[PDB]
């Protein structure tokens, strides 16, 4: 790992107003890994809500984060320090009859 983990932290706030604790995410993190990160934080025991990768939508600035992009894509330039924390909305989109397997 890198010495002293001061990257830019993101926390996830669900559309219902509940939030998940912030984690440090390098700008070079892919949205794919970001999306994965959520799946690990999100209770798999949860019924009626996401829990698999495809179910959860990450939206920042009114833009859904495609996994094929990086966090850097939605971030500020290098002219910003690692003191900026980001709070991103998670919108709950439930599929019509679908659940893990």
Curated annotation (Swiss-Prot):
InterPro entries: MUB (IPR017000), Ubiquitin-like_dom (IPR000626), Ubiquitin-like_domsf (IPR029071), UBL3-like (IPR040015), UBL3-like_ubiquitin_dom (IPR039540). Coiled coil: none annotated. It is found in: Cell membrane. SUPFAM superfamilies: Ubiquitin-like (SSF54236). Transmembrane segments: none annotated. Keywords: Cell membrane, Lipoprotein, Membrane, Methylation, Palmitate, Prenylation. Residues 8-74 form the Ubiquitin-like domain. GO terms for cellular component: plasma membrane. It is a lipid-anchor. It comes from the Eukaryota. May serve as docking site to facilitate the association of other proteins to the plasma membrane. Heat stable and remains soluble at temperatures exceeding 90 degrees Celsius. This is Membrane-anchored ubiquitin-fold protein 1. It comes from Arabidopsis thaliana.
């Amino acid at each position: 790992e890198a010495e002293v983990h001061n990257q830019l932290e993101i926390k996830f706030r669900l559309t219902d107003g509940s939030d998940i604790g912030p984690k440090a995410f390098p700008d070079a993190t892919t949205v794919s890994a970001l999306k994965e990160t959520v799946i690990s934080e999100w209770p798999r025991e949860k019924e009626n809500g996401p829990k698999t990768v495809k179910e959860v939508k990450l939206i920042s600035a009114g833009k859904v984060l495609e996994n094929s992009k990086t966090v850097k894509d939605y971030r500020s330039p290098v002219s910003n320090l690692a003191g900026a924390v980001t709070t991103m909305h998670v919108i709950i989109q439930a599929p019509v009859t679908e659940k893990e397997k």
